[PDB]
Amino acid sequence: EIDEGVFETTATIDNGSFGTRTIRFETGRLALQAAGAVVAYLDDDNMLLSATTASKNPKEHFDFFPLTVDVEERMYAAGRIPGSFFRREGRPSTDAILTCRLIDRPLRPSFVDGLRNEIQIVVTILSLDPGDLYDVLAINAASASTQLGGLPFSGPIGGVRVALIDGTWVGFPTVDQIERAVFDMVVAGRIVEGDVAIMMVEAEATENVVELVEGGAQAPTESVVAAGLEAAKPFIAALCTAQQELADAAGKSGKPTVDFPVFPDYGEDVYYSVSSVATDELAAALTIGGKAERDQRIDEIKTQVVQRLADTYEGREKEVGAALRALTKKLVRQRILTDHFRIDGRGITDIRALSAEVAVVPRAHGSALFERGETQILGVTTLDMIKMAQQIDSLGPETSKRYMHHYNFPPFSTGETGRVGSPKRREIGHGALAERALVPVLPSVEEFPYAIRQVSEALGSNGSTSMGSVCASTLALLNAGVPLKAPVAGIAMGLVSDDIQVEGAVDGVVERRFVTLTDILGAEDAFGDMDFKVAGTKDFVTALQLDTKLDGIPSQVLAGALEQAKDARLTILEVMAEAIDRPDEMSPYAPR
Template structure:
C-alpha cells in the first residue's frame, strides 16, 4: 500500500543460480478514468500500462463477445524518437499483434458467457529495458486491470515465459522465468504459459505457446537436452509455482482496489435445458469416437452423431419440449 489511493505489490520470482525477477503491480496512479488500470513493472526497468473499459450498453446485432485487445508500442519506450520522413508511429508491429493474441486467448473465455457489452483492453509499453520481453508481463497487467474493473471476469490470470537453459558441470537443466534475450540464446526451448489458480490450489493451464529457440539445434548437437513431450510437461509443471505467485500478487491488489462487480445483461447462445438435452445424447457417444485413430473415420463418425442429435433436437423444439433459443 502506497498512500490512501495507490495500491502496489511485488512478486519476487526465484530463478536459482540465475537470480530473481521482480514483478510489481500498481494501481491508482495512472489512467484513473478507465474502469480498471494497472501499471506492471519488471525489475523496475520495463513498465506497461493496461487499461480496461467497457461500454454501458450491449451491442445490438452482435452474436459474439466484442472484446478488443490492443497493444501500443512506442519508440520512446526504448529511448528512441522517430525522425527523418517517418515522424509518427506506424501500424502495430508483428510482435504487438502476437502479444494481443496471447492476451486474448486466456482472457476471452474468462468473461461471463453471453456478455455483449464492448470491452477494450489497451496495453501501452511505456518503458522497456534492452533485451527484455514484455509479452508475459502484458498478460498479467491485462488480467489485473480487468479483474479490478467491475466486469464479470473470473480471474486473476497469470502468464509467465520460461526458457529451458541446459546445465553445465554440476548444474542441472533449469527452467528460467522471464528470461532475457541473452539467456534465450543459451536455451533449447521457450514457452509462454497462462493459467489460473483453482479453489483446491492447483493451477489450471489455459494457454500454452511453445517453440524451439534459434540455437537449439546446435545446442542439442553439443549434448543439450532434446525437447520432447516429457520435457514440455516438465515445463508446464515448472510454470505453476510462478503462476501461483503472480496470481497471489494480483489478488492482493484486487482485494484492495477492485470495484464491485456490476450487473451486465447476458445473452446465452442456448438455454440450459437445450444444453442438457444435447449433452445427454452426445457426451457418452463422443468419448469412443474421439478415441478413433484414423482421422477420416473419426470425422465421419463425428458427423453422423452430430446429424442424429440435431435431428432429435429439431424434433424436440418443434414438439414444444424445448425453447427455440
C-alpha cells in the first residue's frame, strides 16, 4: 500500500439469500514489466494473475490478428503435487483450453480491426478454492489487464456465471450451488450507452436437469433462457464499472490510447475504384440460387473486374480482392434485408436436406451417419467397464469423466489437404459443446454401468458441424442401446442486423431491421451479426453457444429467434425419430 499498489478496486455481486461474492482487482504490485498486470481475487481466497503484453515490432507477414491467450492452471493452486511422471505441469488440459477459448471469443472482436501486433494474455491461476471455478474470473482478469495495458481495447468486458437455483439466477455460483442448479450460463458483455450489451453466451444444462424438473423445478425453456440473458446484465454492469468508470483500476491511471499501427485492406482508393464499377454489376447475379448456374455470373464478373482493375493497382491484388469480397458481402446482406431471400436460394426457415442412417459400421457398439446438405457426420460410440472412464486430474472439481466425446475433423472433410494429428483448439471446443449437450440426458452410472466414448468424425463440412455432430452422436447412442431420457437435436442459426432506409414509411428514414435465418452455411457465418447454436430435446434447451458484437438486441427478437430454433430443432428431432425410435438390442459385446 506504499505506491502504485492502492488501485485496489472492488466489486460486489449480491445473490440475495446465497450471500455476496466480493470480486477484487489490484495492480502495480505483481508483474510490473508487463504492459498490463491485474491480480483478481474472488471471496479473498481465489487469487489469479493476468498479464497482457504486446510485441514491440509490428508484424506484416501475418494476415490475421495474432492474439494468443494462454491460461496456466499451475497445480500448486490446488495444494497437490502434479500427477505427471515428471511431476510438472505439461500441456494444457481440456479445462484450460476451454477457458482460453471462452476468453478469446469476446475479447477478439473487442480489438480494433487491422491490428497486426502480437498480443499475448497469460492468465496464471495462483490460487483457487476446491469449490470454485476460474474461467469467468479469467475473463474478467484478462479484460481488466488489457484495459490497463493501454492497448486499443474496447470497453472492458465483464463476465459472470449465472445459474437457475429454484427460480432465481445466482451469479458466480459455488460448485455445490450449481449442483442444485438447473441451467448453467456464462455471459460476457460490455456497456455501450449506460446499458449492457451481450457479447458471448455459453449455456449448458446441469447433469441433474431431469431429476430437478421431475422433482418440482421448471425446465429451461427458451423464455427462461431469455429471462436469464436479462438476469446477468446487472452483474456484468457492476463488473464493468469496477474497471475504469469511476477512477478505479484503469480509472486511477486514466490510460489514454497509445499509438499502434493498423493495416486495413482497403482504405479509400481500391474501395472506391471497385465500388464505382462494381455496385451496379450485382443487380440480379444471385437469382438462380444454385451452385451450377447462379455462381456462373458472380464468378465471371469477379474475373472481369479483376482483369479490368489491373491497370493502376499493380501489386495490390489482395487489396482489390478484399474490397470485392466486402462489396459482395454488403450487397448480399442488403439482399437479405430487403428481398428477404438468401444466397443459397432458401428461406429463413428452410432446414437443409436431412437424412439420418443408423448402424452403418459393423462390429462397432453404435454407429450413425447424419447428413444435412453438404454437412455429414459419422458418429461411433463404444462401451467398456467403469474402470475405463477417464481419470481427469486438474483444478476442476470433477475427478472422473464417464462420458468422453472426441470430435475429429480430418482435413478431407472440407476437401483441402492439411495435417492430421493433435486436434486444434476449435475441435476441443466443438467436442466440449457436444459433450455438454449430451450430458443432461445420459442415464445415471448405477442405472447404466458402462463408460461411454463417442468419436464424431466429420466426413463432410460446410460450417457449424458441431450441431450435426450432436445429432449424429445421439443417433449413435440410441443405436448402441443406451437408455436416454429423450432424444436430442441441435442446429446453428444466424441473425443479420442492419440499418436500412425506408422511403414508403413517411420519408427516407433509416430503421434498424433484423433477419433471423436457419441453418447457417459456411459462407453465411460471416454474412450475419449474431450467430448462435441451439441444441436440446423437445422439452428444454441443453447447449447454447452465442457470440456477437451487436450493441444489444430487443428481448422480442431474441425470443422469436429462440422460438424458430425450437421449431427447427423439432423438425430435426422428427427426422431423427422416423429412422430410429427406440434403443436397439445391445451389441454382442454386452455381458449377461
